[PDB]
Amino acid sequence: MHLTPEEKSAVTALWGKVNVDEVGGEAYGRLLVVYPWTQRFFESFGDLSTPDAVMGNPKVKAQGKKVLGAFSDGLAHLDNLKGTFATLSELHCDKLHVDPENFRLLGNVLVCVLAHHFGKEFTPPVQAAYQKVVAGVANALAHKYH
Amino acid sequence: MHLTPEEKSAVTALWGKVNVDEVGGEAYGRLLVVYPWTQRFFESFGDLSTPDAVMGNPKVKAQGKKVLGAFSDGLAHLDNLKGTFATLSELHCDKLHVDPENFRLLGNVLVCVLAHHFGKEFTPPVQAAYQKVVAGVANALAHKYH
Amino acid sequence: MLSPADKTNVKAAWGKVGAHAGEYGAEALERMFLSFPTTKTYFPHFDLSHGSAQVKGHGKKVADALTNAVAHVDDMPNALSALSDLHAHKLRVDPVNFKLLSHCLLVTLAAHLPAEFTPAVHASLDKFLASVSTVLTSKYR
Amino acid sequence: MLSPADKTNVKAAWGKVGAHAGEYGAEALERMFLSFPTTKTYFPHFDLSHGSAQVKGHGKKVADALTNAVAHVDDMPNALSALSDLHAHKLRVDPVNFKLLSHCLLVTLAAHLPAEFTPAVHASLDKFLASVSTVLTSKYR
Ligand code: HEM
Numbered sequence: 058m059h060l061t062p063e064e065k066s067a068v069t070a071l072w073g074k075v076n077v078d079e080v081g082g083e084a085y086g087r088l089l090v091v092y093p094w095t096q097r098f099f100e101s102f103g104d105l106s107t108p109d110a111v112m113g114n115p116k117v118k119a120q121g122k123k124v125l126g127a128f129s130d131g132l133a134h135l136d137n138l139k140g141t142f143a144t145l146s147e148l149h150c151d152k153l154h155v156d157p158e159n160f161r162l163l164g165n166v167l168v169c170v171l172a173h174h175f176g177k178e179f180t181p182p183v184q185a186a187y188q189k190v191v192a193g194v195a196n197a198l199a200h201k202y203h
Numbered sequence: 204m205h206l207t208p209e210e211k212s213a214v215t216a217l218w219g220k221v222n223v224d225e226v227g228g229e230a231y232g233r234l235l236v237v238y239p240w241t242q243r244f245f246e247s248f249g250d251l252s253t254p255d256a257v258m259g260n261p262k263v264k265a266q267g268k269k270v271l272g273a274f275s276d277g278l279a280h281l282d283n284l285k286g287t288f289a290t291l292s293e294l295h296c297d298k299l300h301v302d303p304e305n306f307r308l309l310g311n312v313l314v315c316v317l318a319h320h321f322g323k324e325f326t327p328p329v330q331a332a333y334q335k336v337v338a339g340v341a342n343a344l345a346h347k348y349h
Numbered sequence: 350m351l352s353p354a355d356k357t358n359v360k361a362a363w364g365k366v367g368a369h370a371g372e373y374g375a376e377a378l379e380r381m382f383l384s385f386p387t388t389k390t391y392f393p394h395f396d397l398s399h400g401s402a403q404v405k406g407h408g409k410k411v412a413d414a415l416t417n418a419v420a421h422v423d424d425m426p427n428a429l430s431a432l433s434d435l436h437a438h439k440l441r442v443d444p445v446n447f448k449l450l451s452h453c454l455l456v457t458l459a460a461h462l463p464a465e466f467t468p469a470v471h472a473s474l475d476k477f478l479a480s481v482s483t484v485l486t487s488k489y490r
Numbered sequence: 491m492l493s494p495a496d497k498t499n500v501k502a503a504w505g506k507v508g509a510h511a512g513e514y515g516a517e518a519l520e521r522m523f524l525s526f527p528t529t530k531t532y533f534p535h536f537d538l539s540h541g542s543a544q545v546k547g548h549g550k551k552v553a554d555a556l557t558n559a560v561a562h563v564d565d566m567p568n569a570l571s572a573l574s575d576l577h578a579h580k581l582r583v584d585p586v587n588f589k590l591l592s593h594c595l596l597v598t599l600a601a602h603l604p605a606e607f608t609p610a611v612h613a614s615l616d617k618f619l620a621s622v623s624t625v626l627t628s629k630y631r
């Protein structure tokens with residue numbers, strides 16, 4: 058944690074232009090195409106046999122929406138990510154059994170998606186501020202692992 | 204900087220038996236041998252071509268001495284590693300230009316050398332406390348990088 | 350391993366890059382320096398200000414090497430032999446830093462090729478860059 | 491690439507391991523779970539307490555497969571093909587965890603071979619373990 062006033066305002070202004078359901082669908086789908094081992098949690102989701110089936114899967118789109126809504130609200134608590142995501146951290150470790158390395162993989166796919174979505178307004182310094190936040194959230198979610 | 208009572212004890216009792224100059228010389232020498240690209244900081248040390256030349260190089264042994272000694276002083280300040288190592292952190296970034304990933308490599312090599320030297324008293328639980336500590340000190344040394 | 354379809358996708362995206370290869374190489378670098386500041390430790394001899402000629406020069410050289418690699422995708426080890434020698438015995442960059450550059454490379458392409466950066470092309474490009482990192486670091490020890 | 495001296499060092503170290511293979515595979519797993527707790531997420535169906543027979547039994551299976559790779563050191567992708575397919579398409583372990591077990595395996599070797607774990611052999615074994623790791627993750631995508 059610890060962005061400058063400039064960094065926080067950049068993260069917030071960009072985030073104000075995002076469609077959380079659409080981006081959540083795109084990010085989680087590309088997570089599943091580009092790093093296919095992350096599909097291991099999702100056999101009950103149906104057909105994931107090709108890129109188009111994955112991106113088109115409605116179960117994949119709703120996971121994406123749930124996950125990005127939680128991310129989205131965490132953006133309001135930039136000062137206390139660890140306290141905000143404590144209960145979710147505990148849940149992913151004790152119940153879901155999710156390797157925290159997968160949070161790092163979603164953070165990098167997320168940053169690629171933002172760049173593809175916003176083109177030239179996703180400048181190097183805006184990217185830098187977003188890299189710190191996705192690592193901060195990955196670190197806050199892995200915090201209660203044991 | 205957070206250890207359980209069991210972890211702190213395991214760390215402190217084993218370190219009581221370590222001859223710093225000897226362990227330092229071996230750990231740093233094996234660093235240069237096993238990950239030879241770490242030899243890029245030490246062109247002035249002379250002959251580093253074969254394992255034997257690395258392991259009996261006097262400048263290699265003197266550097267290991269220096270480093271492990273500072274490492275050992277940090278073991279006294281386990282509740283505040285970032286404030287203890289802030290000055291050396293700055294030095295490594297601003298004047299030496301050392302990739303902090305080198306700190307993780309030395310941490311794993313040091314653990315191998317303790318196991319080699321202490322054999323079966325380096326049990327799984329003692330290793331786990333040492334793994335926490337070396338991760339802490341590498342994170343402390345990278346703190347002031349910018 | 351790169352399948353036949355990955356090679357068709359990389360040659361397709363890279364041909365679209367065409368003539369901007371150089372400029373995207375420089376942007377990728379600037380993104381790396383700003384997002385992952387520990388990678389600056391390998392460039393203490395450089396003027397790292399926005400648009401310095403040294404940063405532009407190095408961006409073009411990185412670009413050209415990638416182009417060579419796409420051209421010879423079936424024989425990368427032979428085609429990048431000189432470069433992989435240089436990184437293993439001279440530059441000696443820790444291997445973790447190749448993933449940071451590849452990431453920033455990926456982000457540069459995403460931002461400049463909205464039509465071509467579909468999910469399958471993204472997957473083929475990340476594999477391809479992983480493969481190039483693997484050939485550049487193979488002689489390390 | 492493994493050199494002739496690398497192959498001789500690995501076959502001599504592993505010859506000394508001998509019949510303790512299985513026991514050392516189990517200690518390596520225990521070291522891993524306690525040092526790097528995120529690796530327990532692939533094993534929720536296992537008793538991971540100290541002494542567990544499931545850990546022991548997995549120990550031996552990991553051990554046996556190393557032995558077979560050491561015996562086929564010039565033809566690994568073929569000997570480990572069945573294994574590569576099971577980790578990529580079924581278990582799907584993030585490739586990151588292969589470095590963590592490799593470290594722990596090395597620590598285990600060090601603790602039991604005070605004589606044979608020289609600087610040279612340590613280097614050869616690390617290279618041998620990264621090569622098995624590469625082969626095991628070869629078919630992931
Ligand atoms: C920014 C990162 C993430 C956040 C903020 C996040 C948050 C969430 C939330 C809010 C839920 C639903 C919790 C509930 O049921 O009350 C959830 C469930 C879940 N998450 Fe995560 N998550 C993230 C990353 C991931 C990743 C990368 C994976 C796997 C590759 C994962 C695997 C799952 C699974 C399998 C569930 C259960 C869904 C169900 O039962 O339908 N999560 N996550």
Ligand code: HEM
Nearest residue numbers: 241244245269270271273274291299301305306309340344
């Ligand atoms: C446990 C982690 C480390 C600690 C506590 C440590 C500590 C030190 C200390 C106390 C010095 C003496 C400098 C002075 O006189 O002001 C030093 C110098 C140095 N260290 Fe670090 N060090 C660590 C790891 C490393 C690693 C892993 C590398 C590179 C692979 C490295 C590269 C250097 C270099 C190049 C110097 C200058 C030595 C010379 O004069 O040739 N250090 N370090």
Ligand code: HEM
Nearest residue numbers: 388391392407410411414415432440442446447450481482
């Ligand atoms: C896609 C991966 C990479 C490729 C294709 C690549 C390619 C190149 C090429 C073509 C050169 C110039 C050769 C010459 O002029 O003789 C070079 C030099 C160099 N590279 Fe790499 N490189 C890669 C990754 C990296 C990384 C990750 C770093 C460090 C963060 C790095 C650091 C350097 C440095 C410091 C130089 C020499 C700079 C100078 O003095 O001009 N490279 N690389």
Ligand code: HEM
Nearest residue numbers: 529532533551552555556573581583587588591622623626
């Ligand atoms: C050198 C590396 C490794 C080798 C040689 C290896 C070898 C094996 C073998 C021989 C099996 C048994 C397959 C069968 O029943 O035919 C197996 C299964 C398994 N491996 Fe790996 N493995 C390695 C690394 C890993 C890592 C790093 C992890 C995760 C942290 C892992 C997780 C698993 C799991 C969860 C199973 C299935 C266990 C069961 O339920 O019986 N493996 N592996």
